[PDB]
């Protein structure tokens, strides 16, 4: 928690996970599940480098990941897809349009929510520095109300860093707090998407505690 | 055109009343009748919710279709935050009505009910830990009304989404103003703004899980109902 805002941004940029590649309608769902399964491991490695995360007990680290993992997968998809209007870039070799998501019942409703988030990011010209902060807030915030001071300390630190990023970009104080608010209000829609996404996945899948624990690779 | 103080005044004057459950000293409380009472209460609350929304500055500038879509997306979240607010001064309890005050042991009678009850209690506890102020509450409720449905909506649509973000920006200015007036540094102002807006994610999560629970008993106010009221 002693890092400067610049050191925080640099830490988070450095921790970014790699973009993974993909392995008919039937094959489409299998490719998407296999991709998500392989990304999860890299998400766990990313989480361990979010300043302050590894200060939590392993139990609490797992609970946070249980709560945030689908939200983190979607905000990364939305980020990857931001410069591909009307499409979603699941992988460099798996670019899909909404028309491909019509074969499965209830798939296109989420496809559209994801596209709308990408359009919102495009409208706001979301910067990579702001995205890695938002993704860190999702990790620390999503499970906090379902288990504390340390989590809120880290969250306050990320808030400071987001403000610092905006003042550094020349925003007035008013524009700083309006942009902060706008970014955080997107997190409510990402929670909504994650909830509707879970319902859809169950309509056809949660990582177990032991699985997340093992990937954390305790020492 | 409103100032921050003017925005606070409008939102405070728009606040709906606290409604009651039925009184009958000959009728002891029973858990078999609890869901009927809560449904009756929520249905009455929805009517006042419509007339509150029409007084949230900028809300009636939208088309009726988009007013309905926003209410469709936010109505349960608004009932839930109202419940949480009413319960804030009553640890361990949910104050559905002043004469309908329940603890979690009374929320175990129905499957999946205690989980949502546990979440509502935790949000109430969070409101206390922050010493959430009434002026801040009505701003948060307004943000839910304008924000919940805006990512799920043509040239008219672009104009109304622009309007909605302009009203949301003014409520942000108002929240900050209230925090500066209370004597917080800017660091504390930014940090508190963030803490408040992050609670809205949990309120959305609760709304989703509560929808699932409502459909599990077998629910939504129809478009024509909401339109007629609006
Ligand atoms: C990972 C867990 C652990 C235990 C087993 N689980 C495996 C199943 O969960 C998952 C998780 C995610 C997806 C994909 C996937 C993959 C990669 C990505 O970056 C993002 C996504 C996004 C996502 C929406 C959520 N999705 C879909 O298909 C989808 C997209 C659009 C509309 C409807 C649906 C598939 C399956
Ligand atoms: C309004 C719709 C439109 C068309 C018909 N109505 C349909 C009924 O939907 C409703 C809506 C809300 C509730 C209550 C109710 C009432 C008042 C309140 O202030 C708040 C709440 C909170 C709420 C959780 C959401 N709830 C429950 O019972 C509950 C609480 C705890 C755990 C599990 C369940 C009942 C029924």
Coordinates of C-alpha atoms and ligand atoms in Angstrom, one line a residue:
Chain A
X1 CA 0.0 0.0 0.0
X2 CA 3.1 2.2 0.0
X3 CA 3.2 2.3 -3.8
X4 CA 2.8 5.6 -5.6
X5 CA 0.0 6.0 -8.2
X6 CA 2.6 5.7 -10.9
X7 CA 4.1 2.6 -9.3
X8 CA 0.5 1.2 -9.0
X9 CA -0.3 1.8 -12.6
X10 CA 3.0 0.3 -13.7
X11 CA 2.5 -2.8 -11.4
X12 CA -1.0 -3.4 -12.9
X13 CA 0.2 -2.9 -16.5
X14 CA 3.0 -5.4 -15.9
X15 CA 0.6 -8.0 -14.4
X16 CA -1.7 -8.1 -17.5
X17 CA -2.5 -11.7 -18.5
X18 CA -1.7 -12.9 -22.0
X19 CA -4.2 -13.1 -24.9
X20 CA -4.9 -16.8 -25.4
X21 CA -6.0 -18.4 -28.7
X22 CA -8.9 -20.7 -29.4
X23 CA -8.2 -24.4 -29.8
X24 CA -20.5 -24.8 -36.1
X25 CA -22.8 -23.9 -33.3
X26 CA -21.9 -27.1 -31.4
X27 CA -18.2 -26.4 -31.7
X28 CA -18.7 -22.8 -30.8
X29 CA -19.8 -23.5 -27.3
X30 CA -17.0 -26.0 -26.7
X31 CA -14.4 -23.6 -27.9
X32 CA -15.7 -20.8 -25.7
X33 CA -15.8 -23.1 -22.6
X34 CA -12.2 -24.4 -23.2
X35 CA -11.0 -20.8 -23.7
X36 CA -12.5 -19.6 -20.5
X37 CA -11.1 -22.6 -18.6
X38 CA -7.5 -21.8 -19.9
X39 CA -7.9 -18.0 -19.1
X40 CA -8.8 -18.7 -15.5
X41 CA -5.3 -19.9 -14.6
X42 CA -3.8 -16.6 -16.0
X43 CA -6.5 -14.6 -14.2
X44 CA -5.3 -16.2 -10.9
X45 CA -1.7 -15.3 -11.7
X46 CA -2.8 -11.7 -12.5
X47 CA -4.8 -11.5 -9.3
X48 CA -1.7 -12.4 -7.2
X49 CA 0.1 -9.3 -8.7
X50 CA -2.7 -6.8 -7.8
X51 CA -1.0 -4.8 -5.0
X52 CA -2.4 -5.9 -1.6
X53 CA -4.2 -9.0 -2.9
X54 CA -1.7 -11.6 -1.5
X55 CA -1.9 -9.9 2.0
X56 CA -5.3 -11.5 2.4
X57 CA -5.7 -15.0 3.8
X58 CA -5.9 -17.7 1.1
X59 CA -9.5 -18.4 2.1
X60 CA -10.4 -14.7 1.4
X61 CA -8.4 -14.6 -1.8
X62 CA -10.4 -17.6 -3.1
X63 CA -13.7 -16.1 -2.0
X64 CA -12.9 -12.9 -4.0
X65 CA -12.0 -14.9 -7.1
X66 CA -15.2 -17.0 -6.7
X67 CA -17.2 -13.8 -6.8
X68 CA -15.3 -11.9 -9.5
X69 CA -14.0 -14.5 -12.0
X70 CA -16.9 -14.2 -14.6
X71 CA -16.9 -10.4 -14.3
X72 CA -13.2 -10.3 -15.0
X73 CA -13.5 -12.6 -18.0
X74 CA -16.2 -10.3 -19.5
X75 CA -14.4 -6.9 -18.9
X76 CA -11.4 -8.4 -20.6
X77 CA -13.5 -9.6 -23.6
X78 CA -15.1 -6.1 -23.8
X79 CA -11.6 -4.5 -23.7
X80 CA -10.3 -6.8 -26.5
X81 CA -13.5 -6.1 -28.6
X82 CA -13.4 -2.3 -28.2
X83 CA -11.9 -1.6 -31.6
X84 CA -14.1 -4.2 -33.4
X85 CA -17.5 -2.6 -33.5
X86 CA -20.4 -5.0 -33.5
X87 CA -18.2 -8.0 -32.8
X88 CA -16.6 -9.7 -29.9
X89 CA -12.9 -10.8 -30.0
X90 CA -12.9 -13.9 -27.8
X91 CA -9.5 -14.8 -29.2
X92 CA -7.4 -13.5 -32.1
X93 CA -8.8 -16.5 -34.1
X94 CA -12.3 -16.4 -32.6
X95 CA -14.0 -13.2 -33.7
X96 CA -17.8 -13.5 -33.6
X97 CA -20.7 -11.3 -34.6
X98 CA -24.1 -11.3 -33.0
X99 CA -25.6 -13.3 -35.8
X100 CA -23.5 -16.2 -34.8
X101 CA -24.9 -16.0 -31.3
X102 CA -28.4 -16.6 -32.4
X103 CA -28.3 -20.4 -32.6
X104 CA -28.4 -20.9 -28.8
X105 CA -31.5 -19.6 -26.9
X106 CA -30.6 -16.7 -24.7
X107 CA -27.1 -16.3 -26.1
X108 CA -27.8 -13.1 -28.1
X109 CA -29.2 -11.2 -25.1
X110 CA -25.8 -11.4 -23.4
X111 CA -23.9 -10.9 -26.7
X112 CA -25.7 -7.6 -27.0
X113 CA -25.0 -6.6 -23.4
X114 CA -21.3 -7.2 -24.1
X115 CA -21.5 -5.2 -27.3
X116 CA -23.2 -2.3 -25.5
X117 CA -20.4 -2.3 -22.9
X118 CA -17.7 -2.2 -25.7
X119 CA -19.6 0.7 -27.3
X120 CA -19.7 2.5 -23.9
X121 CA -15.9 2.0 -23.6
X122 CA -15.5 3.4 -27.1
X123 CA -17.7 6.4 -26.4
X124 CA -15.6 7.2 -23.3
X125 CA -12.3 6.4 -25.0
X126 CA -11.3 4.1 -22.1
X127 CA -7.5 4.1 -21.6
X128 CA -5.5 0.9 -20.8
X129 CA -4.3 2.5 -17.5
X130 CA -8.0 3.1 -16.5
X131 CA -9.0 -0.5 -17.6
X132 CA -6.4 -2.3 -15.4
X133 CA -7.6 -0.2 -12.4
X134 CA -11.3 -1.1 -13.1
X135 CA -10.4 -4.7 -13.4
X136 CA -8.6 -4.5 -10.0
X137 CA -11.6 -2.9 -8.4
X138 CA -13.8 -5.7 -9.7
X139 CA -11.5 -8.3 -8.0
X140 CA -11.4 -6.5 -4.6
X141 CA -15.1 -5.4 -4.5
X142 CA -17.2 -8.2 -5.9
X143 CA -17.1 -10.5 -2.9
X144 CA -16.5 -8.0 -0.1
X145 CA -20.2 -7.9 1.0
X146 CA -20.5 -11.7 1.1
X147 CA -17.7 -13.0 3.4
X148 CA -12.3 -6.1 5.3
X149 CA -10.5 -2.9 6.3
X150 CA -7.5 -4.1 4.2
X151 CA -9.7 -4.6 1.1
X152 CA -11.2 -1.1 1.5
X153 CA -7.7 0.3 2.0
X154 CA -6.6 -1.2 -1.4
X155 CA -9.8 0.0 -3.1
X156 CA -9.2 3.5 -1.7
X157 CA -5.6 3.3 -3.2
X158 CA -7.0 2.3 -6.6
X159 CA -9.4 5.2 -6.4
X160 CA -6.5 7.6 -5.7
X161 CA -4.6 6.1 -8.7
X162 CA -7.6 6.6 -11.1
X163 CA -7.9 10.2 -10.0
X164 CA -4.2 10.7 -10.4
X165 CA -4.4 9.3 -13.9
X166 CA -7.1 11.8 -14.9
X167 CA -5.5 14.8 -13.4
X168 CA -2.3 13.8 -15.2
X169 CA -4.3 13.8 -18.4
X170 CA -5.3 17.4 -17.8
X171 CA -8.9 16.9 -16.6
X172 CA -10.5 19.5 -14.4
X173 CA -11.4 18.4 -10.8
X174 CA -15.1 18.3 -12.0
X175 CA -14.2 16.2 -15.0
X176 CA -12.1 13.9 -12.8
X177 CA -15.0 13.1 -10.5
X178 CA -17.5 12.8 -13.3
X179 CA -15.3 10.3 -15.2
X180 CA -14.6 8.3 -12.0
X181 CA -18.3 8.0 -11.4
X182 CA -18.9 7.1 -15.1
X183 CA -16.3 4.3 -14.9
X184 CA -17.7 2.9 -11.6
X185 CA -21.3 2.9 -12.9
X186 CA -20.1 0.7 -15.7
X187 CA -19.2 -1.9 -13.0
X188 CA -22.9 -2.2 -12.1
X189 CA -23.7 -3.2 -15.6
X190 CA -20.8 -5.7 -15.6
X191 CA -22.2 -7.2 -12.4
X192 CA -25.6 -7.4 -14.1
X193 CA -24.0 -9.1 -17.2
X194 CA -22.2 -11.6 -15.0
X195 CA -25.4 -12.4 -13.2
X196 CA -27.3 -12.9 -16.5
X197 CA -24.3 -14.8 -17.9
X198 CA -24.3 -17.2 -15.0
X199 CA -28.1 -17.8 -15.5
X200 CA -27.4 -18.6 -19.2
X201 CA -24.5 -21.0 -18.4
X202 CA -26.7 -22.8 -15.9
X203 CA -29.4 -22.8 -18.5
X204 CA -27.2 -25.2 -20.6
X205 CA -19.7 -24.2 -14.5
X206 CA -18.5 -22.4 -11.3
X207 CA -14.8 -23.0 -10.5
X208 CA -14.6 -25.0 -7.3
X209 CA -12.9 -23.7 -4.1
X210 CA -10.2 -26.4 -4.4
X211 CA -9.5 -25.6 -8.0
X212 CA -9.0 -21.9 -7.3
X213 CA -6.9 -22.8 -4.2
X214 CA -4.7 -25.1 -6.2
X215 CA -4.1 -22.5 -9.0
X216 CA -3.1 -20.0 -6.2
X217 CA -0.2 -22.4 -5.5
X218 CA 0.1 -21.8 -1.8
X219 CA 3.6 -21.5 -0.2
Chain B
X1 CA -29.7 24.4 -14.7
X2 CA -30.3 23.4 -11.1
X3 CA -27.5 23.9 -8.6
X4 CA -26.3 21.1 -6.3
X5 CA -28.4 22.6 -3.5
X6 CA -31.4 22.8 -5.8
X7 CA -30.8 19.3 -6.9
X8 CA -30.7 18.0 -3.3
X9 CA -33.9 20.0 -2.5
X10 CA -35.8 18.5 -5.4
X11 CA -34.8 15.0 -4.6
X12 CA -35.6 15.4 -0.9
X13 CA -39.1 16.8 -1.7
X14 CA -39.7 14.0 -4.2
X15 CA -39.1 11.3 -1.6
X16 CA -42.1 8.9 -1.3
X17 CA -43.7 8.2 2.0
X18 CA -43.0 5.2 4.3
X19 CA -45.9 2.8 3.9
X20 CA -47.5 0.4 6.4
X21 CA -48.6 -3.2 6.5
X22 CA -52.2 -4.0 7.6
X23 CA -53.0 -3.5 11.3
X24 CA -55.2 -5.9 13.2
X25 CA -54.4 -6.6 16.9
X26 CA -56.6 -9.8 16.6
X27 CA -54.3 -11.2 13.9
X28 CA -50.9 -12.3 15.3
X29 CA -48.0 -12.3 12.8
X30 CA -47.7 -15.6 10.9
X31 CA -45.1 -16.6 8.5
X32 CA -47.7 -18.2 6.2
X33 CA -49.1 -14.7 5.4
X34 CA -45.8 -12.9 5.2
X35 CA -45.4 -13.1 1.4
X36 CA -48.9 -11.9 0.8
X37 CA -48.1 -8.9 3.1
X38 CA -44.9 -8.1 1.3
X39 CA -46.4 -8.4 -2.1
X40 CA -49.2 -6.0 -1.1
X41 CA -46.7 -3.6 0.3
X42 CA -44.4 -3.6 -2.7
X43 CA -47.4 -3.2 -5.1
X44 CA -48.5 -0.1 -3.1
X45 CA -44.9 1.2 -3.0
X46 CA -44.5 0.9 -6.8
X47 CA -47.3 3.4 -7.3
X48 CA -45.4 6.0 -5.2
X49 CA -42.2 5.0 -6.9
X50 CA -43.6 6.1 -10.3
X51 CA -44.6 9.5 -9.0
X52 CA -41.2 9.9 -7.4
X53 CA -39.3 9.1 -10.6
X54 CA -41.3 11.7 -12.5
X55 CA -39.9 14.2 -10.0
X56 CA -36.3 13.2 -10.5
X57 CA -34.9 16.1 -12.5
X58 CA -34.5 15.2 -16.2
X59 CA -36.5 12.0 -16.0
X60 CA -39.7 13.3 -17.7
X61 CA -37.6 14.9 -20.5
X62 CA -37.1 11.3 -21.8
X63 CA -39.7 9.6 -24.1
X64 CA -42.3 7.5 -22.3
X65 CA -40.9 4.3 -23.8
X66 CA -37.5 5.0 -22.3
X67 CA -39.1 6.1 -18.9
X68 CA -40.7 2.6 -18.9
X69 CA -37.5 0.8 -19.8
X70 CA -35.6 2.6 -17.1
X71 CA -38.3 1.7 -14.5
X72 CA -38.5 -1.9 -15.7
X73 CA -34.7 -2.2 -15.2
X74 CA -34.5 -0.5 -11.8
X75 CA -37.8 -1.0 -9.9
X76 CA -36.6 -3.9 -7.7
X77 CA -33.3 -2.2 -7.0
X78 CA -35.1 0.9 -5.9
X79 CA -37.4 -1.1 -3.5
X80 CA -34.3 -2.9 -2.2
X81 CA -32.3 0.3 -1.5
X82 CA -35.3 1.9 0.2
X83 CA -35.7 -1.2 2.4
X84 CA -32.0 -1.1 3.2
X85 CA -32.2 2.6 4.1
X86 CA -35.3 2.1 6.3
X87 CA -33.5 -0.7 8.1
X88 CA -30.2 1.2 8.6
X89 CA -30.9 2.2 12.2
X90 CA -32.1 -1.3 13.2
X91 CA -29.2 -3.8 13.3
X92 CA -30.1 -7.4 12.5
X93 CA -33.5 -6.4 11.2
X94 CA -35.3 -5.5 7.9
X95 CA -37.8 -2.7 8.4
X96 CA -40.2 -3.6 5.5
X97 CA -42.8 -1.4 7.2
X98 CA -42.7 0.3 10.7
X99 CA -45.1 -2.4 11.8
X100 CA -43.4 -5.2 9.7
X101 CA -39.9 -5.5 11.1
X102 CA -38.3 -9.0 10.5
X103 CA -35.2 -10.8 11.6
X104 CA -33.4 -13.5 9.7
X105 CA -35.0 -16.4 11.6
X106 CA -38.3 -15.2 10.1
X107 CA -36.7 -15.3 6.7
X108 CA -36.0 -19.1 6.7
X109 CA -39.6 -20.2 5.9
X110 CA -39.1 -20.0 2.2
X111 CA -36.3 -21.5 0.1
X112 CA -33.7 -19.0 -1.0
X113 CA -35.2 -16.2 1.1
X114 CA -32.6 -16.2 3.8
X115 CA -29.8 -15.7 1.3
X116 CA -31.3 -12.5 0.0
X117 CA -32.2 -11.5 3.6
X118 CA -28.5 -12.0 4.5
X119 CA -27.5 -9.7 1.6
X120 CA -30.0 -7.0 2.6
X121 CA -28.7 -7.1 6.2
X122 CA -25.1 -6.8 5.0
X123 CA -25.9 -3.7 2.9
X124 CA -27.7 -2.1 5.8
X125 CA -24.6 -2.8 7.9
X126 CA -22.5 -1.2 5.3
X127 CA -24.7 1.9 5.2
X128 CA -24.1 2.2 9.0
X129 CA -20.3 1.7 8.7
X130 CA -20.3 4.6 6.2
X131 CA -22.8 6.7 8.2
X132 CA -24.7 7.2 4.9
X133 CA -26.5 10.5 5.0
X134 CA -30.1 11.0 3.7
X135 CA -29.0 13.6 1.1
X136 CA -26.5 11.0 -0.2
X137 CA -29.2 8.2 -0.2
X138 CA -31.6 10.1 -2.5
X139 CA -28.7 10.8 -4.9
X140 CA -27.9 7.1 -5.0
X141 CA -31.5 6.2 -5.6
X142 CA -31.7 8.6 -8.5
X143 CA -28.5 7.2 -10.0
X144 CA -30.1 3.7 -9.9
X145 CA -33.1 5.0 -11.7
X146 CA -31.1 6.6 -14.5
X147 CA -28.2 4.2 -14.7
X148 CA -29.7 0.7 -14.4
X149 CA -31.4 0.6 -17.8
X150 CA -29.2 2.9 -19.9
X151 CA -26.9 0.1 -21.3
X152 CA -29.9 -2.0 -22.5
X153 CA -31.9 0.4 -24.7
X154 CA -31.3 5.3 -33.5
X155 CA -30.7 9.1 -33.4
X156 CA -33.4 9.5 -30.7
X157 CA -31.7 6.9 -28.6
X158 CA -28.3 8.6 -28.8
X159 CA -29.9 11.9 -27.7
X160 CA -31.6 10.3 -24.7
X161 CA -28.5 8.4 -23.6
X162 CA -26.6 11.7 -23.8
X163 CA -29.3 13.4 -21.7
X164 CA -29.2 10.6 -19.1
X165 CA -25.4 10.9 -18.7
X166 CA -25.7 14.6 -18.3
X167 CA -28.2 14.2 -15.5
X168 CA -26.0 11.5 -13.9
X169 CA -23.0 13.9 -14.2
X170 CA -25.1 16.5 -12.3
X171 CA -25.9 14.0 -9.5
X172 CA -22.2 13.3 -9.3
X173 CA -21.5 17.0 -8.9
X174 CA -24.2 17.1 -6.1
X175 CA -22.7 14.1 -4.2
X176 CA -19.3 15.8 -4.3
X177 CA -20.8 19.1 -3.2
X178 CA -22.5 17.4 -0.2
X179 CA -19.2 15.8 0.7
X180 CA -17.2 19.1 0.4
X181 CA -19.9 20.9 2.5
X182 CA -19.5 18.2 5.2
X183 CA -15.8 19.2 5.4
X184 CA -14.1 16.2 3.7
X185 CA -10.8 16.7 1.9
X186 CA -10.9 16.0 -1.9
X187 CA -9.1 12.7 -1.3
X188 CA -11.9 11.7 1.1
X189 CA -14.4 13.1 -1.3
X190 CA -13.2 10.9 -4.2
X191 CA -12.7 7.9 -2.0
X192 CA -16.3 8.3 -0.5
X193 CA -17.9 8.8 -4.0
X194 CA -16.2 5.6 -5.1
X195 CA -17.3 3.7 -2.0
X196 CA -20.9 4.8 -2.5
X197 CA -21.0 3.9 -6.2
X198 CA -19.4 0.5 -5.6
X199 CA -22.3 -0.3 -3.2
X200 CA -24.6 0.1 -6.3
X201 CA -22.9 -3.0 -7.9
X202 CA -23.9 -5.0 -4.8
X203 CA -27.4 -3.6 -5.0
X204 CA -27.6 -4.7 -8.6
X205 CA -26.4 -8.1 -7.6
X206 CA -29.1 -8.3 -4.9
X207 CA -31.7 -7.2 -7.4
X208 CA -30.7 -10.0 -9.8
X209 CA -30.8 -12.7 -7.2
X210 CA -34.1 -11.3 -5.9
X211 CA -35.6 -11.4 -9.3
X212 CA -34.6 -15.1 -9.5
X213 CA -36.2 -15.7 -6.2
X214 CA -39.4 -13.9 -7.2
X215 CA -39.7 -16.0 -10.4
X216 CA -38.9 -19.1 -8.4
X217 CA -42.1 -18.7 -6.4
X218 CA -44.4 -17.7 -9.4
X219 CA -43.8 -10.9 -10.8
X220 CA -42.8 -8.1 -13.2
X221 CA -44.8 -4.9 -13.6
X222 CA -45.9 -5.0 -17.3
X223 CA -45.0 -2.3 -19.8
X224 CA -48.7 -1.3 -20.0
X225 CA -48.9 -1.1 -16.2
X226 CA -45.8 1.0 -16.0
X227 CA -46.9 3.1 -19.0
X228 CA -50.4 3.7 -17.5
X229 CA -48.9 4.8 -14.2
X230 CA -46.3 6.9 -16.0
Ligands
LIG1 C1 -14.5 -20.9 -16.6 C2 -15.5 -21.8 -15.8 C3 -14.7 -22.5 -14.6 C4 -15.5 -23.8 -14.5 C5 -15.9 -24.1 -15.7 N1 -16.2 -22.7 -16.4 C6 -16.2 -22.8 -17.5 C7 -17.5 -22.2 -18.1 O1 -17.6 -20.8 -18.0 C8 -17.6 -20.0 -19.1 C9 -17.2 -18.6 -19.0 C10 -17.2 -17.8 -20.1 C11 -17.6 -18.3 -21.3 C12 -17.5 -17.4 -22.5 C13 -16.3 -16.5 -22.5 C14 -15.0 -17.2 -22.6 C15 -13.9 -16.4 -22.6 C16 -13.9 -15.1 -22.4 O2 -12.7 -14.3 -22.4 C17 -15.1 -14.5 -22.3 C18 -16.3 -15.2 -22.3 C19 -17.6 -14.4 -22.1 C20 -18.7 -15.3 -21.8 C21 -20.0 -14.6 -21.5 C22 -19.3 -15.3 -20.4 N2 -18.7 -16.6 -22.7 C23 -19.8 -17.1 -23.5 O3 -19.6 -18.1 -24.0 C24 -21.0 -16.2 -23.9 C25 -20.6 -15.1 -24.6 C26 -21.6 -14.3 -25.1 C27 -22.9 -14.6 -24.9 C28 -23.3 -15.7 -24.2 C29 -22.3 -16.6 -23.7 C30 -17.9 -19.6 -21.4 C31 -17.9 -20.4 -20.3
LIG2 C1 -44.1 -5.1 -7.3 C2 -44.4 -6.3 -8.3 C3 -44.9 -5.6 -9.6 C4 -46.0 -6.6 -10.0 C5 -46.4 -7.1 -8.9 N1 -45.2 -7.0 -7.8 C6 -44.8 -8.1 -7.6 C7 -44.3 -8.4 -6.2 O1 -42.9 -8.2 -6.2 C8 -42.3 -8.1 -5.0 C9 -41.3 -7.3 -4.8 C10 -40.7 -7.1 -3.5 C11 -41.1 -7.9 -2.5 C12 -40.4 -7.8 -1.1 C13 -40.2 -6.3 -0.7 C14 -41.4 -5.5 -0.6 C15 -41.3 -4.2 -0.3 C16 -40.1 -3.6 -0.1 O2 -40.0 -2.3 0.2 C17 -39.0 -4.3 -0.3 C18 -39.0 -5.7 -0.6 C19 -37.7 -6.4 -0.8 C20 -38.0 -7.8 -1.4 C21 -36.7 -8.6 -1.7 C22 -37.4 -7.9 -2.8 N2 -39.1 -8.5 -1.0 C23 -39.2 -9.8 -0.4 O3 -40.2 -10.2 -0.1 C24 -38.0 -10.7 -0.1 C25 -37.2 -10.1 0.9 C26 -36.1 -10.7 1.4 C27 -35.7 -11.9 0.9 C28 -36.5 -12.5 0.0 C29 -37.7 -11.9 -0.5 C30 -42.1 -8.8 -2.7 C31 -42.8 -8.9 -3.9

